[PDB]
Design a protein around this ligand. Structure first.
Ligand SMILES: Cc1onc(O)c1C[C@H](N)C(=O)O
Ligand SMILES: Cc1onc(O)c1C[C@H](N)C(=O)O
Ligand SMILES: [Zn+2]
Ligand SMILES: [Zn+2]
Ligand SMILES: [Zn+2]
Lengths: 258, 258
């Protein structure tokens, strides 16, 4: 049986090729995760179909209904067999789905438009002139929502009630906001994305300060999946063979335009 | 009943207290992993007994006898119920024992005596005046033995045949060799240990270049252990609350001597 892979359109992990209009199936996409899916399928020996998550979300649980959305939801409800994307390994997710050992290490970071008077989270939490937010339905928003350390707690208090909303639907929306805000908006996103955007035209943003935490991305499968074990060993094998490092350089800096 | 924890005497993870001679059981030790063992046990709800691995090794499988040594061996043969130490998650090890999601992210790095004309792995591979080696029976030596990228394979070809041996039995042994070699010996060890020693008197060593790879440490249990699930969730919980970051600052920098 062909394994249904759920993923998300997020550069440079998964993007439609320039000429996708004349291409079919998995051939329409390119990116780090597209190359990764290919390797994993090769080592685990299976056929697969790449599908883009319907609601375009990573995955969070509705507090009222307790229903999971995004890619996590597609796995939880049997709509997908595996998720290959920049999906963060977290406690709440690990309780409902399975994760392979990380294929990428990262942390939450701050994105600013070049020139804005911000050097750290501390600096953001001490002022109100510059607005800041995070992605919705993801691990980053949950990070601030559940943080007890002073600076991050203060930040959550501000963001949670901010008006207009400081939260965005997609990473692209958060980046666009930083770029057209004349420096009045700062975006909190994972270092991987931040570093990627920093090397792309118009080269007007930059990552400032160190990472707020240390975590990683993992390939997720539904609880009790027969693919879990093989995938996990496959990830380890690829990291050790150097493939993962190869892919990182291929999509991040060999393609950098700044 | 009581969970037998295997660990290794490696500063600042596990060290004998100055007055351990007048203390009993677990109270005889201190360090990052000792602090971590206390928390894991608290959250998982079990009593434990800390024990230092007999052969003082991390773990590798003997080529011919096929017998695992070190902490990995303790778990494989049933001598310990869990290992809490700076044990690297690798494919060959995950094939015989279980690992929790990582509690620390690190990579192989180079340690030199201050003033040594070495800035990277490429620099070491292109010269012969400065010798270099790694730890025995560990993931670092295996990394080089299995590497297929030019620079690293070149380094392995040299190391595996260098005389006298460039490999050491313990981290401390490698650090001493660097300090006593007047710049003629460089040591390859994980960035975590490198960063730690850099802050220890006489403050004569330094980490140079970027990391050669990206990986992490995980708490290990015998395959199929009933402790596996809870321990993994405990690590994720503790990382998200910031404990792991707190512990590294405590043992690495708050106690720095340089
Ligand atoms: C990618 C990405 O970049 N910043 C973010 O918050 C995310 C989403 C995050 N990796 C998640 O799994 O929710
Ligand atoms: C700690 C440490 O530091 N450098 C090293 O090679 C090691 C050992 C390594 N973590 C292992 O598991 O073999
Ligand atoms: Zn391959
Ligand atoms: Zn709702
Ligand atoms: Zn606790």
């Amino acid at each position: 049986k062909t394994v249904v892979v759920t993923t998300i359109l997020e550069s440079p992990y998964v993007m439609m090729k320039k000429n996708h209009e004349m291409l079919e199936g998995n051939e329409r996409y390119e990116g780090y995760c597209v190359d990764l899916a290919a390797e994993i399928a090769k080592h685990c020996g299976f056929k697969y179909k790449l599908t883009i998550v319907g609601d375009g979300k990573y995955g969070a649980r509705d507090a009222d209904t307790k229903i999971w959305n995004g890619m996590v939801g597609e796995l939880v409800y049997g709509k997908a067999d595996i998720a290959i994307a920049p999906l963060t390994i977290t406690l709440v997710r690990e309780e409902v789905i399975d994760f392979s050992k990380p294929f990428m290490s990262l942390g939450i970071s701050i994105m600013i438009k070049k020139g804005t008077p911000i050097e750290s989270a501390e600096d953001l939490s001490k002022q109100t002139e510059i607005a800041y937010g995070t992605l919705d339905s993801g691990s980053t928003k949950e990070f601030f929502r559940r943080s007890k350390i002073a600076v991050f707690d203060k930040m959550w208090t501000y963001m949670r009630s901010a008006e207009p909303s400081v939260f965005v639907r997609t990473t692209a929306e958060g980046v666009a906001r930083v770029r057209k805000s004349k420096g009045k908006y700062a975006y909190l996103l994972e270092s991987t994305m931040n570093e990627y955007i920093e090397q792309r035209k118009p080269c007007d943003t930059m990552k400032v300060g160190g990472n707020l935490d240390s975590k990683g991305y993992g390939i997720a499968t539904p609880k009790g999946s027969s693919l879990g074990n093989a995938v996990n060993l496959a990830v380890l094998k690829l990291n050790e063979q150097g493939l993962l490092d190869k892919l990182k350089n291929k999509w991040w800096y060999d393609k950098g335009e700044c």
